[PDB]
From a paper:
The Rpd3S complex plays a pivotal role in facilitating local histone deacetylation in the transcribed regions to suppress intragenic transcription initiation. Here, we present the cryo–electron microscopy structures of the budding yeast Rpd3S complex in both its apo and three nucleosome-bound states at atomic resolutions, revealing the exquisite architecture of Rpd3S to well accommodate a mononucleosome without linker DNA. The Rpd3S core, containing a Sin3 Lobe and two NB modules, is a rigid complex and provides three positive-charged anchors (Sin3_HCR and two Rco1_NIDs) to connect nucleosomal DNA. The Rpd3S core reveals a compact architecture composed of three modules: a Sin3 Lobe (Sin3 and Rpd3) and two modules involved in the nucleosome binding (named “NB1” and “NB2,” respectively).
To explore its natural working mechanism, we assembled the Rpd3S complex with endogenous nucleosomes and resolved the cryo–electron microscopy (cryo-EM) structures in three distinct mononucleosome-bound states. In three nucleosome-bound states, the Rpd3S core exhibits three distinct orientations relative to the nucleosome, assisting the sector-shaped deacetylase Rpd3 to locate above the SHL5-6, SHL0-1, or SHL2-3, respectively. In detail, the Sin3_HCR, Rco1′_NID and Rco1_NID bind at SHL5/4/2 in state 1, respectively (left); at SHL1/5/7 in state 2, respectively (middle); and at SHL2/7/1 in state 3, respectively (right). Instead, aided by the auxiliary subunits, the Rpd3 is located above SHL5-6, SHL0-1, or SHL2-3 in state 1, 2, or 3, respectively. In state 1, only the H3′ tail extended from SHL7/-1 in its fully extended conformation can satisfy the distance to the active site of the Rpd3 (left). Around the active site of Rpd3, a fragment from the residues 1 to 5 of H3 binds the Rco1′_PHD1, which is consistent with the previous reports. Furthermore, our cryo-EM analysis reveals an extra density for a peptide with a long sidechain extended into the pocket of the active site in state 1. Together, it is most likely that the residue Lys14 of H3′ has been griped in the active center of state 1. Besides, Dong et al. reported a conformation state (Rpd3S_NCP 167 bp/MLA) similar with our state 1, consistent with our opinion that H3K36me triggers recruiting of Rpd3S to nucleosome but may not infect the conformational change during deacetylation.
Residue numbers in the entry:
A (entry chain d), H (entry chain h): 30 to 124
B (entry chain e): 1 to 5, 37 to 135
C (entry chain E): 255 to 391
D (entry chain c): 13 to 118
E (entry chain f), G (entry chain b): 21 to 102
F (entry chain a): 38 to 134
I (entry chain g): 65 to 118
The structure:
DNA sequence: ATCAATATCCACCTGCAGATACTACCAAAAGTGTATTTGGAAACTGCTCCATCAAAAGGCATGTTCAGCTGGATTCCAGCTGAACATGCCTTTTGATGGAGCAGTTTCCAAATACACTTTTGGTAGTATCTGCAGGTGGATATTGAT
DNA sequence: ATCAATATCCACCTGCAGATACTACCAAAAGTGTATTTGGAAACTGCTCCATCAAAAGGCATGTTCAGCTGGAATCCAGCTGAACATGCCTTTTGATGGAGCAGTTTCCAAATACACTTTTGGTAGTATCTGCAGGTGGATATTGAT
């Protein structure tokens, strides 16, 4: 039988129900959102891999991800995204 | 210091602006599906014969084409206004495409 | 240069009613000056800050800065170690005190608040989706 | 008794799946422990940002369901997102209403 | 066969595409130019799509081939898979 | 005395500066400006010589290209003088603004 | 602390850069514009160069940092290493 | 300095000597050619890796390289480059 | 290409100016290296037709 | 049509910085052989999605007319840019010193990988089902154009 | 300013296509626990290149003047585009049919990997050497601009 197609539909729906607790979403809009997530993921991962290559390291760490975020996102997006990532990493390692 | 702390006729150009608003409000596709499909098939046929297309493939091509042409027309309109005109002419298309880097 | 002054005090970096400087875009609270100024009895005329007053005093000439600082260090022979220090204090606009960061980071449960306030892990957190609460379900 | 990693970090996006995609994607020979956590955090942040803007655009249009037109309006009306997605075409998103000043009648 | 078909991009369709771009007055000779530039763009994209397709040893052109051929020219396209 | 009509020396200069490959900005002022700009992202920075040379090369290439586009937009409007609106149009079409 | 330093890009230098671009007559107000655009370009490149440098935990900005910061903006540069 | 900096100087000089027998080359021009070779190499390699990821393959083969050459180079260049590559491979395997 | 451009200039050695003149004078090579800056390469000599005298 | 005045290039010498070899030499990196796993190639097969036909009906494209308004050409005029001097200043160099910073070596130690289980979670079909929204209609409203 | 004629928007209503939803269910995969290996962090060191001065030399930048040519405004006029109407034609929708091509399943075997050893080789350094070229000097002359 035909295989399964993993996607980001359920997590996007969770985030939406958090920000706007009573608005739905279409299906073409959810397709746009999956494509957006994949594109941004690929961009950040490619930049982090380039960084790790330049410095003769063989490991991608949170430092590479943070520098890639600083390189890729413009302006205040970078500040807020760095805040979020740092907070999440700190909470994860505190447990 | 500061301390500041007899049949009705519309005048030429009216229906143009009405259409501009109408088509900048909408989101549909502005070309007919069948002629565009035939055009795509002719081109791909002179590239590699005996081809087949999913429907979503031709739909993607149509969306990309229309987005491209709308952007080109915006740039053309700026280049027309720059020379103190209202009418767009082919030289404006050529200038916009040359500055974008698509031709030279 | 028809600029406008900042919307925050240059000293404490907070908001309020400011006495402003005309030359530079700095603005200060009234108690955040040296010495603090009475909001009622404010001297009208041209108010300049400490830095711009230092500049206009030296006429924006630093050869004269050489001159006056050499003479100053020659005079303060009693405390020669604190000579240059005692000369720089007169070129700075006032500040408020904030601990150096090599002191705050000895204790990891201590975090600087929003306006430079103390927080010690007993602060719950500000409520973010309680901006979402004013909207509510 | 087995918690997830995204629940241990306090996220909605999956940390295990992002970790796997980083591993099998040919990006580096090794992948740290906090790289997927950081990446999931920033992905969730950007998602929430654009979704909030699009939901506002949907509300002021008297609707109760987000469509690609609302995503296009939200993206093109913000400066940072328009910088981030400047070379992206959204399928069936339309354009921004804009008529040049010299064209309007006077 | 499938010859001609470039005049199938009629003049009203180009006028609509211009109205969506904000144009108020249109010349008489821009229809030829628009047909030329559309043909050029289409050839440049279809060549790459067919290259991908035939590398995969297929006979059907998938939508992913099109979005790849577009992405490789700085014309990323959201909403069709990927 | 012997004078040249306006524009003659301009064409001479165009040919002369298109025949050459040397740099056109002075090195010391550009170096000072680069250091002052970088003074805002991090204090106490050091630069290699080749870093500043690369920056000068890239900047000059960028400005020459921009001036070509600007001259195009000026000839479009039946003019010979380039004006700031020409620069603004060339940068808007390019996508920089 | 360096100040102004932007008027060091004199008017004759900009006239030379224009002559190499083929310009025959120059206005009076383009010098301000050129200084503005040069400053913008330089900030955009130097920010990325410094980012690379400080990720490598160095204090000296290498030429490779500059060519990387340039390559990441579609301004590839040959002849300086790489 | 113990570290060695491998480059393409000697190979570019061999190519030059067979193409133009009595023409030298400057050092700056040699650096230009070095950057050119590295740039084109990483372009082709990145495209090959991408179109091997698309097809759920693990090996980079002659086919991936040929398709990357066809995708990256313009018409006549791509035709001649494909000719050269196939000639080299068939001479290699029959050796 | 660059060696031909150099010999046409009556020189014996290739300099970056010759590489630039060779790249920018070809069509497909110029399309392959359109977004590339070559150090000390200069530009291609051309003046617009309306700027010329008379 | 003539001619002085520049500015450019053609011809020749020369001192020198850069290109060209050679030995050393030396890691050090590539080629040779071999045992092993595994990923990609063949063959089969089901089924899904594409191409072809068909018809019919209405919405869109086409051709024509008429007139208004826009684009282009001509004149003029003022003011703004360029060309040529005459000072003066600030860039270039090149020589030397100080010294911070970066690259190489050794430990070691913390962290990421590999493997086996086991429960959870996210996805697909089937089927379901509400419900938001698109289509149709009328009524009010704002705007346009000629008096 | 008036008024009449159109196009757009708002309010109401209705059917239905799409979004929320289990349930099975279920299969894939993520989290947990050990043992191992290896890559990255820390201290030390030396030597390299970057900053900071100094001191002329002269080549470029700055300010002034003058005039001429170009950009901008005003007029006029033809011609070309738009707006509207009638006509037909061809796109879109619904529906069925054949059937080719794609995706999954099993087998299996040709090839890429991992290790260990030996041999070129190509890269840095002197180390030396030499010559192609950048700079300087004279003279021919091609072009410009005023007569
Ligand atoms: Zn204050
Ligand atoms: Zn002040």
């Amino acid at each position: 039988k035909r295989s399964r197609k993993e996607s980001y539909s359920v997590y996007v729906y969770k985030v939406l129900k958090q920000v706007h607790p009573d608005t739905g979403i279409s299906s073409k809009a959810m397709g746009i959102m999956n494509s957006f997530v994949n594109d941004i993921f690929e961009r950040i991962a490619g930049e982090a891999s380039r960084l790790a290559h330049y410095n003769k390291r063989s490991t991608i760490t949170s430092r590479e991800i943070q520098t890639a975020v600083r390189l890729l996102l413009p302006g205040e997006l970078a500040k807020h995204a760095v805040s979020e990532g740092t907070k999440a990493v700190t909470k994860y390692t505190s447990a | 210091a500061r301390t500041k702390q007899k049949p009705h006729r519309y005048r030429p150009g009216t229906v143009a602006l009405r259409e501009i608003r109408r088509y900048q409000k909408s989101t549909e596709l502005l070309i007919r599906k069948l002629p565009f499909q035939r055009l795509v098939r002719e081109i791909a046929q002179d590239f590699k014969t005996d081809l087949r297309f999913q429907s979503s493939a031709v739909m993607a091509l149509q969306e990309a084409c229309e987005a491209y042409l709308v952007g080109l027309f915006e740039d053309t309109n700026l280049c027309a206004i720059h020379a103190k005109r209202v009418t767009i002419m082919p030289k404006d298309i050529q200038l916009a495409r040359r500055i974008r880097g698509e031709r030279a | 240069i028809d600029f406008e002054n900042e919307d925050f005090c240059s000293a404490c970096n907070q908001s309020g009613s400011f006495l402003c400087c005309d030359t530079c875009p700095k603005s200060f609270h009234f108690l955040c000056l040296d010495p603090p100024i009475d909001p009622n009895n404010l001297p009208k005329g041209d108010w300049h800050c400490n830095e711009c007053k230092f500049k206009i005093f030296i006429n924006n000439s630093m050869a004269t800065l050489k001159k006056i600082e050499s003479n100053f260090i020659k005079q303060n022979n009693n405390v020669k170690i604190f000579a240059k220090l005692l000369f720089n204090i007169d070129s700075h606009n006032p500040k408020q005190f904030q601990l150096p960061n090599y002191i705050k980071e000895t204790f990891p449960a201590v975090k600087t608040g929003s306006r430079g306030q103390y927080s010690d892990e007993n602060d719950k957190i500000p409520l973010t989706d309680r901006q979402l609460f004013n909207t509510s379900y | 008794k087995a918690k997830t990693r995204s629940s241990r970090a306090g996220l909605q996006f999956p940390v295990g799946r992002v970790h796997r995609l980083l591993r099998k994607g040919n990006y580096s020979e090794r992948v740290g422990a906090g790289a997927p956590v950081y990446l999931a955090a920033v992905l969730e942040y950007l998602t929430a940002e654009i979704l909030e803007l699009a939901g506002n655009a949907a509300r002021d249009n008297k609707k109760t369901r987000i469509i690609p037109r609302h995503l296009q309006l939200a993206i093109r009306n913000d400066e940072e997102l328009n910088k981030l997605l400047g070379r992206v075409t959204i399928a069936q998103g339309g354009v921004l209403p804009n008529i040049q000043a010299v064209l309007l009648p006077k | 066969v499938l010859r001609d078909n470039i005049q199938g991009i009629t003049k009203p369709a180009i006028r609509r595409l211009a109205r969506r771009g904000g144009v108020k007055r249109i010349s008489g000779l821009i229809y030829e130019e628009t047909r030329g530039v559309l043909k050029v763009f289409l050839e440049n994209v279809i060549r790459d799509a067919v290259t991908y397709t035939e590398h995969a040893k297929r006979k059907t052109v998938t939508a992913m081939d099109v979005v790849y051929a577009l992405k490789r020219q700085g014309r990323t396209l959201y909403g069709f898979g990927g």
